[model samples]
Every structure is written in C-alpha cells, then in structure tokens.
Target chain A: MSYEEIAIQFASESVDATTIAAWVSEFAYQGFDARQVINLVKQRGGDDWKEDVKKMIVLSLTRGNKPSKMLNKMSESGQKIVNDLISKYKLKSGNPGRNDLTLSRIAAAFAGWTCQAAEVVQDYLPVTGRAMDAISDKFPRALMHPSFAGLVDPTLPEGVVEDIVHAHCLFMIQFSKTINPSLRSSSKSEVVSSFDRPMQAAINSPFLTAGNRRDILMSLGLINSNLKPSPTVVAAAKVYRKL
Target chain B: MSYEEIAIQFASESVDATTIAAWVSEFAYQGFDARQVINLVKQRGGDDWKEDVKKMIVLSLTRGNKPSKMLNKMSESGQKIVNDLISKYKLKSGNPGRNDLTLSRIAAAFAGWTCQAAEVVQDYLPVTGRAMDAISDKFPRALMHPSFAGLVDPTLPEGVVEDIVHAHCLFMIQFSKTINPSLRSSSKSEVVSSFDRPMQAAINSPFLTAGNRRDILMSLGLINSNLKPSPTVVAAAKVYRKL
Candidate 1:
C-alpha cells in the first residue's frame, strides 16, 4: 500500500502492529526518514486527538455529561490516563473542566491537563498501547503551545496548525480567568506574565515580514494600553517601513 | 545610458536637463508604461525623501539650528517648497520641527508638512524640474500613510515599503499622544480606534499564512490588555491550532 493509504489506516485506527511493522519495513527501500515518518504520524494523531478534545468539551456543555461518561467516549487508555490526572490534580467533579469556557481558561487547562499527563506517560505508560501512545505523543505538543507566541520563522514547517490551537487555548484561558474573579490574584498575574515572553519574541523576531510585524504591533495596541514599545521594536518598525 | 545610470544621476542631483529630457523620451520607444514609470519614480523619491527627513530631524536638535539654516542644507528647490509649508503652518523660528524628535513625532510632522504641500504641488508644480518633480511626485505618496493599516495582498508589489513607513508613522503618532497629556483627547481616541479596522483586516486576510496570523494575534496581545477578540479572530485561531 502507498504511504497515504498507510497513513489513513493509522489515522482511522484500523491497523494492527504487524501491519504497522510491515509498513515500516517498506520505508527502508524508499529512503523514508524515520523521524519524518514519526512526525507525520504524530501530527495526524495529534489532530485527531484535538478533535476528540473539542467534541468532548462541546458534549460536556451540551448534555450535562459527567466526567465518567466523557471518559468513556475517549479511547479506553486515554480515559484511564486522564482519570489518573483528574484524581491527582484533585480536579473536582463539581467544577467541570469543560465549563467556564474561554481561550485563557482552555489554555491554562490545556497546560494543566497536559503537563502532568506528559510527565506520567513518559515515566509510567508503556509505548505498546496505541491510544496511550497517541495521547502521549500529543501531550508534549500541548505543553509547547505558548512557546510559539513570540517567535517567527518563515521557513519553519512546524506549528502552522499548532500555533492556532495554542493561541486559542491562551485566549480561552485568559477569558476564564477574567470571569472568575475568585481566581487568585497571583494566578491572574501569572497568566498575564506568560504573554510577555511571547509578545517580546514576536516584536524582537528578525524573521517576520514587515507587514506581519506591523499588524502584530497594531493588534497588540488594541488589547494593551500600557505598551512602552522598546527601541528595538521601533527601529525594526522603521526598517520594515522602508522595505 | 541605462535606467540604472539615469537613476543614479537623478538620485545624486548631477544630471543636466538634456540628459533628463533624453531619458524621459526613452520611455516612448522602450514601451515603458507611463504610470509604472511614475510609480517607480515616486517610490524611489519617497525613499530618498524619508532619508532626508531622518537627517533633518536629527540635525534639528544639534547646534540649536533654526529652519533657515536647515533649509540651506536641503536641495535648493526643496528649500523653497518646504519654506512655503513652514510659513503657511506659521511654525515659529524658536520651535524648530526637530525639537519634538521621535519617529512618531517626525511622522506626524511629516504628515502635517506634506499634506498642503502635496495639494499645492498637484495643482501648481509642473512635472518639469528634475529634482523638484521627483519630490513633488512623492509628496502625495507620504499622505497615504494610515490607509495601509487594514489591507493585505501578498501579490501587491508597490506598497510594502510604504506600508512600513506609515506603520512607523502611526506608531510614533500614538506614542507622541501617550506622552503628551495635553495633546487633544479626541485625537487619541481617533488614533486608537483606527487600529481596529487594520486588526480585522489582517485577521481576515486570505493572503496571510497561518503562521503569520498567529504571530500577528500574539503580537497584538502584548500591547492591548482588554482585547475583545473578534469572532473571526477566534475562528481563525481555532483553524490554525488544528493545522
């Protein structure tokens, strides 16, 4: 079968390990780099995982579903892994993870949800189970989301999709924090502080096109009022203006 | 002589009328589109003008030079033309334009300085004198600064540099307003509100890559704390997250 066919099978969870191993063997003659193949699978699997998360979040809001029922909707291993997190984090059944939705809340939850999960998977979850492996592969990606905020590289092939997801999570997390005044003052400051690194990254990034840089500055202006633009940002703005 | 040779001569202000007219005549047989030629000249001249403005602003503070001495350093006709603006604006000899030095301050001055000058030239300045005509051609181009804020077309060739300059101007103007409390409240609101249109434009731009969109959003988040992200922005973020 073609690589695409193999990918589709893997995406749909239809292939056994024997088939997957056979597919891997086929790559030897074709000079398919193992890392590339792994990345492709992880990206595809991560997408599917994100879809499941979306569906699960939407369902949690719609049917007044319990975490117990929601857990069942995920792959069995994923449910089991998340349940451990749910228990360890002391995430109460009373305050559902899916409710109080906002980009900031989602981002914070995404961070909270994935950081420990990634740690646990790395330490305890064996690499054998398909569902657990898929979740494990994507967990680190969730942790990496906020890092994309400040950096720019036109040539980088990664993070086109991941960037958006992280941006969404950050926004949702911020929104949740805003609405929840009971949220600790320290936590609010932490969330706000998280944005500073990324903000500076984009402003200082040499790789971004002038058009994009300006747009970013303007957009930031709309949301922030206390912006004391650095000399570097102003100088970069000057250079881009002339280009 | 080649276009490059002719451009160099024109740039250095070294060409005789015979050389200038002969070069202008070359456009006929070469089938050079007149409007394209005009645009090329304007963009080039605008660049030169921006450089001169930078120098003039820098010189304005040093040695306590007045506009009269500053005019002497400019091209003869440029001196005549800007003198008219200086006189028309009733700018004081004591308050040199350079006293308020910053990119934004200069940008605002640039706007104020060029507006009536652009109008005057369009009516009265014949497309004849080589250096004067070059400056006149670019005067109106400088006036189109704020217009670039909201639009994006990856295919649009001419405006990229111009867009950056205007962006710098807008940024400077905003910065100037922020530092000056007595600088009319209405204008502050006006500058602040203008950003919204561009924010939406970039967010909605079809030509922008997904990576760029996220960078722009993140950059915007840095400056604005109370950003009410549009539904479109959120949707775009969601899409990018998956990619």
Candidate 2:
C-alpha cells in the first residue's frame, strides 16, 4: 500500500462506538494493554527498518509527544520525556537520544507488530506488517486485536483464540464473524478477492505455521479452506510433542 | 538448548552486584522497563510451539503470581489478578479464565522475547529463542541488552545499537566488552568456541538479517570479523535504499 492509503488507514484508526460495541469483549478483555495499544499509535509514517534505524518515526500527538528522530541529539529533558513516554506508553525501553526512541520502543514491545506497523508508515514498514495489515483489514474491529497480536495478550477472550483455532483443532483456522461472518472456510476466489500481493507475502512468511499459513491463505481468500487434520491427529501430535 | 541445560541457565539468571555493575548502562537505560523484565522471568522450563499453545507455562515466583494454564478454567480472583498484572507488570492482555493468562501475557509483552523465554520453559519455545539465548550467553551482562532488544526501547544509551552496529557502521557488529573483551573480530575457532548447534540454528534463523546472523556467528564465536564493505558502501546502500 502507498503512503496515501496508509495515511487513510491511520486516520480511520480511531475507535468508533460501533467498533467498540462489536469488539467490546476484546476491548474489555482483562490485561488487554489498551494503554500500550493507545501508545502504539506512534510510528505512523516515513520510517525504515532493514539493517538499523536510519530515519525518524512520527508519534501520535494524542500521546502527548513530540518529534522523535532515531539519531538526533537528545537533550537532558529529551531523555526525561522519552523516559516518560516509555512509562506512559508501557514500551520496553527508551534512551536519551531522539534517534531510535520513536519506533524502537514499540518494536520491542510488539514482536512482528512494530515492523509491520512501520511498513505502513514509510512504505518502509517491516516484513511482519503484511500479515498484520491483512488481519487488520479483515478484522476492521480487530485493528489491535489479540487474534493476530501473537501471544502478547489474553487469548481466552472470545475471539482471540477462536479467530485462529476452531472448537478444538488447535491450529490456526481463521474465519472472522464480522469480516467473512462465517465460522468455516469459503471458496478461494471469494476469500482471495479481498487480498493482494502484500497479503500473499505475509501469508507466505515464516512467522506463521503451516497450519496458520493455510488458515491465513484461506482467510485472505487465497484458497478454499480444506479438511482439517482430525482432533485425534492433533491431540496425538500434542501428546507426542509433550513426550 | 535442552531442558536440563536451559534449567541451568534459568537457575543462574540472578544478578550479582559485580556483574550488575559491568552492564549497568543497559540496566540503567532510562525507560528500561525493568518491571516488565522482572515479570518476564515467567515462562521458564518445558513447553511446545508447533501448532498452537497447548500446555501450561510456568510463572516466576519472584513475581506475585501463580500457575498460569492456557486453557484451564480461571476463577473470579484469577480474572482480577490477571487484570491487576496487566496494570502492575505491564503485559498486554489476560482473560479471566486461567488459560493462557500466564505466558500469553508475557508472550504478548515481548516479541521474540516471550517465545525465546518460553523455549527455555517448555523445551518447546518458538524459533526465536536461539538468537536470544545465544546473545544471552554472549552478553552475560547483557542478558536483556537493548542492542539485541530491537527497536522497542531507546538507542542513545551506551550499548543498545552498539551491540549491533558499531558507532557508525549502520549494521549489527556485536563484540562483548567482557565476552570477547575486543571490539574487532578474532579468528573463527576463537569466536566459534562460544556457540554450538542450537546457536547455529539461531544464527541461521530467518529472524535476523544476514549481517546480524554473521555477527552472531562472530559473537557466538563462529566467524572471524572480516573487513566491512566500507562505510561508503553501506552509506551508498542506505541512500539507494531510501531512493
């Protein structure tokens, strides 16, 4: 996606009452880290993340911050403010320099989340952003949903694990209620119609499992959902996995 | 790499003031989120990670918490305490159900951090653990150094990016102050002495960049530090990359 498209996504990132009502369970899920997600609004656009940080990542004004350049000379007060932001935003760390203070903290906070989020910013976001973006677009209400949020947040909340695994298969079998409004898979052409090449990259990335990849492929409408390995098979796998 | 070995590492995770003072800069890096790290002590010992979460992730007694089973039934106070942990220790989310509240919170908190940490726990950690453990063993002082911590924290502090890129190389150039006690690379067998097959796996994982992997090989005592492509070369790459 281009900068204009991302900017629109960012602009639309605000929580409307309808979205809040729909995802009230996730919103209300204990330990949701809304505070951190609120702060995650940082790193909107024009950032890079291949080798090391070389550019500035913009922060959301809603968080009471200012310009954050990765390598800029940081003042004593700058150090304190960055520190404050870390505390306020619940990021992992922030140093005295303006250099990486912007995206680094969030990157550490979220695994693939930051890199992927950065991807949308500069059209230079990290690789994980594709998976995240696809999920984000699919679960419009799941902008920061834990389904794709990784093991970071509570998964027992209705949709968290359910988004991935169905009843008891124990693999990622995603079928959004709001997005596709179905519990099971649909045809490839139908699901694939919603995604593009970037989505393809995310689904193909090693970040997910073969099952997860398959589920993602289906979710992206890339392919038709197929038969799941039986619960007995998965259960046996788990038992053997433990042994 | 194995359960017995990881348990040994976990047993040795405590800080002596002497070792503490050596890497004081990282520990002292403002906005370091020590509270979270204290909590990250969770997820040690046996688990699996192929398809989905299926086992109990143990919690650290150092923190005020108890057994955290992913799918176990959570109680009323279980829900309350999980909520409190989100605020206190600063994890992302947790549900009222006893299930997944344990490592899930910590998993969501740290990106590669949780999976790596979990590997030590379940012997079933995700793939990222190797990179983290290799670095952990290398920088004993930097058990949680920001250099390897990723963009989640500040970079201007003494050692964050220094562990990766040297002062201006803009690439990961890891040399331990105490590990190798040398800024430049030594010969292969010399560096390679520090790592093993698991280290090889981590060094080879797709999570890190080629440069990072190369540096890990050196840091793990795998490869000799060779001449860099030249700052001019990297600078040109960065410029071209931007264009």
Candidate 3:
C-alpha cells in the first residue's frame, strides 16, 4: 500500500503521530521523498527534529508547502515541537498589529485533523450501524439538516465531509463538557448517540470557517493554541489585549 | 533553471501570476511535475482552469496540498478562480461560528506574496541605495526598533525575512491611500520614503498577523474579500453580519 494509505490505516487504528513517525523513520532513506519524510520526522520531537523542521520549513517554502499532517493532534510529542516553533516565531493571537493568531491556530489545528474518519464517528456517536453509512453516503447531508444547511453542502468532497463529521463530534463533546462543569471528561465523543444535537452543535461552532462552515477555525485554540491567552483558554483574551 | 527560480525571477520583474502561468503552460509535458503544472494552469483563467483547480484542489488534498502560489494575489484572473473556490466553499470571516476567514485570507494572501522582494522595497519606498541593505542586512532588526520589539525577531529565515519587508511596503502603501480621499491611487509603494515609518506601520497594521504578525490576515477582505463587507471595505461589515 502507498505510504498515505498506511498513514490513514494507522490513524484508523488509533495510532498517534509518533507511532506513524517511528514507522516511517524506520524505512530506509533511499526510496522515500525526503521532504515528506522530514515533515513526519519534524512532528517526531527531539532537539534534532526541531532543527530539521526549522530548516526544512524554509526549504518546503520553495516547494509545495503542504500543511502539516492532521494526525499530529493526538500526539502531545508532535504538539511539543509544533508549539516550540509557534513560540519561537512568537506566533501569539490578539496582538493584532501583526499576523493573526486565529489563522495560525486554525492552520495548525487543521494540520492535526488531516487524518480521515467518519464511520468512526457513527460508532462514537453510536447510531444504527450501517445507517450511519447513509449519512456518510450522503456525506455532508448527514449533518446539514436545515440547521446545518449553511454549515455544509452536498458539494463538499468526502475528505472535507469526513472532517466535518469528526469536527462535529469534537464540538458536541466540547458542549457535553461545557455542561455540568465536566465532571465526566476532557475530550471529543460518546454517549452523544443520535446525530441531531451534535450536528447542530457543529453547525453553531465558531471554530470552523465562517463562510463555508466546513473547515476548522482558530477558536480551536480552546482545546489547544500555539499562541497564548486563547479566547477559550480557560484563561482569557481580555488579559492578553494589554499583553 | 528551475520553475521556482523562474517564478521568483519573474515576480521580481513585476510579471504577475497570469504571465507566469502562460510561460509555464508553454513548456511541453515531458518533464514537469503534473501537480505543479495544474497549480499554474489552475491559476490560468477560462472554464477549464476552474475544473482543473477544483478537481486538482481535491487531488492536492490527497498529496502534498501546497498552499496556492503567492503570485495569484496579483493576477485578478487567478483571484477570480480562487475567489470562486473560496465562495463556493463559503470561506469568510467574523461569522466566527465556523472556520476562520482570517486564516483563509492569510493563507491566500501569503500565497500571492510568495515571490520574494526587499531590495525592491528600497526602490518602491526609495531609501538610500545600499544603505537600505543595512536595513535588510540587519534584517528583522531593521524593523525591530524597540517599538517593534515584539513584531519580529532576528532568527527568521531569509524567505520570511524578505516577505516581512514586502508586507511592510504593502501596509505603507495602503496607509498612503487611506490618507488621501483619492488624491490618487488604489494599491500596495512610494513617496512615503524612509524605512522607519513603513517599518513602524507594518508593526501596527492589524492585517498581516496577530502573533508573529509576519503573515497576512482576513481583514484584507477590506481590499478583496473571499466573503463579504470588510472592516476596511468601502462597504461596512455590520450590514453583512446579518446577511
């Protein structure tokens, strides 16, 4: 199978970016694309990985400059290096006199969401088995029930469609946490059975693209931000305005 | 010579994105990377380019998925196509309930700023010949007057360094336009000579970025929004808020 297919398969297996990097790094250097290898390894944290990514980030600029992979989200190790670069560059938000914290956060967050998943959401949200396939089959329509009418469209690609399902699950999970002061959890999933509420929560989420309402947004800083004093930082944006 | 080097050289000549695509399209199919070719042709206008970019944009997701080239910012034709994708996808700002318009704009704007420039900034802003070199020589320091203490740092790569100078120039040009009720002008240049003011303005402009402040932002919608009424749009954003 192609390396990408493997990346997807491993991700589906719940393997983190580290395991993916370890597997990729073990492959002999001769046949691989050096650029792709570096990115995977860049997410593999170490002092050397930092230098490699910092230097490679520049070189990548002259080429295709793909967004960092999505699977990095689960890997705190990867987040460490990514966060390092973000800090080293002084990429903070709301200091709006410069580059946007929001955009950077969204770009970085989406990088972590790159792996594909949706049928998985069916299992997480736990609806009828193959009936969930009807949702994925209709793709965006699975979520766009009038409330989501503007949030998604049938025209979106399966890649984006899957992410929306995943993003919704993430959003719903956050809402569940927002309730009852989170006596139960700290993440994106289950007991959220039935798609309607999560789908609406996804529709109302402020973290996805405002226009298309499909892609992830910077408000994701709530879960994690490369920059500090995120709006949902459990901290505050007001404090950072002076900062 | 490589297509990338050619892209930079042409950009330095003020060749713009459309001309660059035509030149590349003229190259026979024998040895080019199809992915890069589609990006170039995608920026080329007419119906076929749209389908090519839309389809290719997806194919791109499965591969390197490089951000679209920077020169596309200069080519209204290319923007026409890109704006189509952005709109069809509904990418926008302030809707806040979805993906950030800010991140999308930053990515899109930087795509155009991709070609390099700084010595050119000296000409546009008209500073002392090689003396401007001292500004660029010190690189980020040129802009880092204590007032700029937070906006930039010295360790950034030359690629990023050059763009900072370019971004500063764009900001100053806009400031100049903002000053006059159209005594003349509609673009990103001179008569506002001296490195200090433009550097300071770059430090202050809210568009490029909020954190590193080195990249672009969604407020650029003021000039050309993929979404709607912009903050600086001759029109108002308040009206669009409800729309």
Predicted structure with the largest lDDT when compared to the true one: 1
Per-residue C-alpha lDDT of model 1 across residues A16-67, encoded as one tens digit per residue = 3343233223211111122332333334335454544443333332222255
| Candidate 2 lDDT for residue A122 | 27
In candidate 1, residue A153 scores what lDDT?
28
Ranked by TM-score, top first: 1, 2, 3
The order by descending lDDT is 1, 3, 2
Interface root mean square deviation of every model, in Å? 33.6, 17.7, 20.5
lDDT of each residue in B1-243, candidate 1, tens digit only:
999999888898755898889888876432112122223323434545443342332233221235554443343444454465344333344323322222222322332222222222322111212322232222222222232232222332233323333333333343335344345345634655545554445324443344432333233331122333333333333332332
- Candidate 2 residue-wise lDDT, A11-98, digit = tens: 1233243432322222121322323432344442213233222122223211212344421556676557555554443433333212
Chain B TM-score (model 3 vs. true structure):
0.23
DockQ-based CAPRI category assigned to the predicted complex of candidate 3: incorrect
Model 3, residue A218: C-alpha shift (Å): 25
Error of 1 at B18 (Å): 67
- Model 3 / residue B30 / CA error / Å: 82
Look at candidate 2 and tell me the lDDT of residue A242.
Answer: 39
lDDT of 2 by residue, B1-243 (tens): 999999999998886998878788666634222223322333421132211111111232111123333112233444454444443333333343222234333322232332222223322212122443343322222122212232112212233323322221111223222233343345434433443232333323343344533343233221236523333323323432341
Which residue runs of candidate 3 sit more than 4 Å off their true CA positions?
Answer: A1-83, A93-98, A102-104, A107-151, A154-171, A174-243, B1-243
When summed lDDT is taken over every stretch of 10 residues in candidate 2 chain B, the lowest stretch is B49-58
Better of 1 and 2 by lDDT: 1
